[PDB]
Design a protein around this ligand. Structure first.
Ligand SMILES: c1ccc([P+](c2ccccc2)(c2ccccc2)c2ccccc2)cc1
Lengths: 110, 110
């Protein structure tokens, strides 16, 4: 795999998984439930493979924060698309997170 | 039960889980790896108990502020690393980002 394509897959898995679990309200359908756990385990594996390459606690927090803001922003657009302050600030936060991951990566000896 | 104590325990379970996940070094240590799975699942369960008494964004704001300091202290303590300039800005972004998004976000329709 490519580590950024795999990261995009992990972001996609987080978006689908949170939404699917929210709709399900628990484990309802067995194949969705097992598949959701497997997609999260595959996503978690990428963090374990990237353990020393970037500082773990800050990296997880930035990825998680970007993820829930992205999930909320996608849900907000589904409710109705607004050029409003939380959506604008959410995009700025995601852009700052992407920039901060580069800065964390380049302040970590490769 | 006491929900404030449960939330503190839920955060502690994540911080210990993340500490075990770093200690496990790419899944090489078997017994911390087994403990890691249990600690995150326990954190999720304690969080599930919490989110019947403290709302999701309110809980996330507390989790974001309290938890980062605790894992950072352990990160210096056992893994010998210091927060550099972009990591400090990242911590500021995590701390203030939840508050501004939660303040300016608009209510769910359903
Ligand atoms: C397990 C179950 C729920 C959460 P989260 C959350 C999900 C994704 C990214 C960031 C946060 C949540 C999301 C939507 C509905 C309910 C719960 C979560 C974590 C800590 C504190 C509050 C909320 C976390 C782990």
């Amino acid at each position: 795999m490519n580590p950024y394509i795999y990261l995009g897959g992990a972001i996609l898995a987080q978006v689908i998984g949170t939404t699917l679990m929210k709709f399900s309200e628990g484990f309802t359908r067995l194949w969705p439930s097992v598949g959701t756990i497997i997609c999260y385990c595959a996503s978690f594996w990428l963090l374990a493979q990237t353990l020393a390459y970037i500082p773990t606690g800050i990296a997880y927090a930035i990825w998680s924060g970007v993820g829930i803001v992205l999930i909320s922003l996608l849900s907000w657009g589904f409710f109705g698309q607004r050029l409003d302050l939380p959506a604008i600030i959410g995009m700025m936060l995601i852009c700052a997170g992407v920039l901060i991951i580069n800065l964390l990566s380049r302040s970590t000896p490769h």
